[PDB]
């Protein structure tokens, strides 16, 4: 019984409206790459060119020579769409470090491919002026969610 | 006329054209040379169609 | 999305409805699409030979036609090519004196802008702003060769 | 007198080159490239008048099309369209007066 | 171009093959990896002969 | 006797200059026009100076 | 706001650059200048800092 719904159906639909054509797509192994797989599986049948960059297996304390010379490889083709397929801890990772080189001023477009886009923090984003999608679940505007909050 | 690109852009009477679609027309679009961009101006409003 | 004010809900993803879309502007930021006005009158403003199967702004062509793109280039704003319909301009009228032609939309907030051949006067100088003059010209006199021979 | 300008062109089209029609030069100008060819503008202009951009008053777009339109008569664009639209569009050619 | 051919069934796999490379004509593909086992090659390459 | 301004540029035999400073040879510099830029080209390597 | 990428500089107008924090605009590719008073590589500051 799985309570999580399937999101790979959403994040494709996401990606047609934006009407994206090349984007880089940053996953963890330890999540997982079904997501990543309907995304591959599709860039042929919707003609994509998606720059996947397996972002999990790094170490702690080399987050800061890893992370900036990762959006050095993201400039060789002047990556500007990029999609976060990650755990609300690890964007909030990637979150940070994108700000400190300055990758989210009026030109960059993120997507935040989790169910919880209002769980993390992103008030750290909301005046960089680059746009940023997400997905949520649990909608804080029905009444029902109103009563649990309070 | 005399054997010569420009003393066929000065006359207008024996009229001249391209194909409709090839490099040979493209040629004469970007041209600036001043004898040419003659002819393409020509060519271009050369009615009916040459 | 994630804007100024923070997280806004765009729309709502199903399985059976994928991407339903419920918008918040409309709008928003328009500003406006510029009116412009003119005549028929060649070879100033004309009919393209297939303005039937054209639409738009590119049915028509001539002088001003090139004049109104040249114009928005230098000062970035979207053309809507109109026509008076009258279709000469104005000249008032004796004891109504409404304005009519491509004069009376520029007073009376139809149209925001008029290009064309219109002639500078002083009865139109009171009461719109003319530009300098594009095009000097002057009365002339105009006969055949004939010859015949004769 | 005639009652529109299409029936002052027609009217010196059939008088064997007795009888002419004074106009504006700009549409002097225009009648003589087009077919069949059979009118001339002679002799300079009369007067000193010029065609401009009317926009309301007070009005935003009035000042900056003001200045647009010098910028296009420097830069050489608007001799350039009159040039495009007057003799390049035009059927009897400017190298239909020369040579025959 | 990454294909996850693996999720196919055996009912519908005369269309779904076709249908499969009728996106790679897309990219007029020449240069195809096959990373299967040998029982799912031979029927790739069976239908790639069809 | 008094042709035009094309036919002006098109002998070399009666020649023809402007003010050496001035808003008229700036007309002809920037001059993007076929008839002229063939007078600019022609005054700009004219000797003697014009 | 993002005022600290390739383009902008700035300048801190007082004694002390080192004494705040640097570290979070030292990677957003804007130049930033200061002045600083406290010479950390004076030997008798070294002395004083040990």
Same mark, same amino acid.
């Given at each position: ?18 009407q ?17 797989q309907?995304v ?45 397929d ?5 964007v909030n ?28 923090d ?21 009444s ?7 | ?46 009615e009916?169609?040459? | ?10 729309g ?13 502007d ?33 049915r028509?062509?001539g ?22 319909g !009258? ?23 139809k149209? !925001? *802008? ?13 009461? *719109?702003?003319?530009?300098?003059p ?6 002339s ?10 | ?16 080159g ?13 009648i ?47 001799d ?21």
């Amino acid at each position: 019984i799985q309570m999580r719904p399937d999101l790979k159906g959403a994040l494709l639909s996401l990606i047609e409206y934006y009407q994206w054509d090349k984007f880089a797509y940053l996953y963890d192994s330890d999540r997982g790459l079904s997501t990543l797989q309907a995304v591959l599986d599709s860039a042929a049948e919707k003609k994509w060119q998606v720059t996947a960059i397996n972002v999990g297996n790094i170490n702690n304390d080399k987050k800061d020579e890893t992370y900036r010379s990762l959006f050095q490889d993201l400039e060789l083709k002047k990556e500007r769409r990029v999609i976060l397929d990650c755990e609300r801890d690890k964007v909030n990772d990637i979150v940070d470090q994108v700000i400190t080189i300055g990758k989210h001023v009026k030109g960059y477009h993120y997507i935040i491919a989790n169910l919880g886009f209002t769980d993390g923090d992103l008030l750290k984003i909301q005046f960089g002026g680059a746009e940023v999608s997400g997905f949520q679940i649990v909608d804080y505007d029905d009444s029902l969610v109103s009563k649990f909050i309070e | 006329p005399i054997e010569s690109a420009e003393d066929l852009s000065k006359q207008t009477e024996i009229a001249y054209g391209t194909l409709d679609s090839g490099s040979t027309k493209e040629f004469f679009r970007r041209s600036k040379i001043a004898v040419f961009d003659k002819m393409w101006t020509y060519m271009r409003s050369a009615e009916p169609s040459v | 999305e994630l804007k100024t004010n923070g997280p806004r809900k765009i729309g709502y993803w199903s399985e059976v409805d994928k991407m339903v879309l419920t918008e918040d502007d409309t709008s928003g930021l328009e500003q406006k699409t510029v009116v412009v006005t003119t005549i028929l009158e060649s070879p100033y403003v004309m009919m393209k030979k297939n303005h039937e199967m054209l639409e738009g702004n590119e049915r028509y062509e001539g002088y001003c036609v090139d004049l109104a793109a040249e114009i928005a280039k230098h000062c970035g704003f979207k053309y809507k090519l109109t026509i008076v319909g !009258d279709g000469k301009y104005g000249a008032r009228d004796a004891d109504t004196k409404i304005w009519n032609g491509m004069v009376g939309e520029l007073v009376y907030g139809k149209a !925001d *802008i008029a290009i064309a051949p219109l002639t500078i006067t002083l009865v139109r100088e009171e009461v *719109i702003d003319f530009s300098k003059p594009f095009m000097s010209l002057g009365i002339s006199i105009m006969i055949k060769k004939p010859q015949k021979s004769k | 007198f005639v009652r529109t300008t299409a029936e002052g062109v027609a009217r010196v089209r059939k008088s064997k080159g007795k009888y002419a029609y004074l106009l504006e030069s700009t549409m002097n100008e225009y009648i003589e490239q087009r077919k069949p060819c059979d009118t001339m503008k002679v002799g300079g202009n009369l007067d000193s008048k010029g065609y401009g951009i009317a926009t309301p008053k007070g009005s935003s777009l009035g000042t900056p099309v003001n200045l647009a339109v010098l910028k296009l008569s420097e830069q050489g664009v608007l001799d350039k369209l009159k040039n495009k639209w007057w003799y390049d569009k035009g059927e009897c050619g400017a190298k239909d007066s020369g040579s025959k």
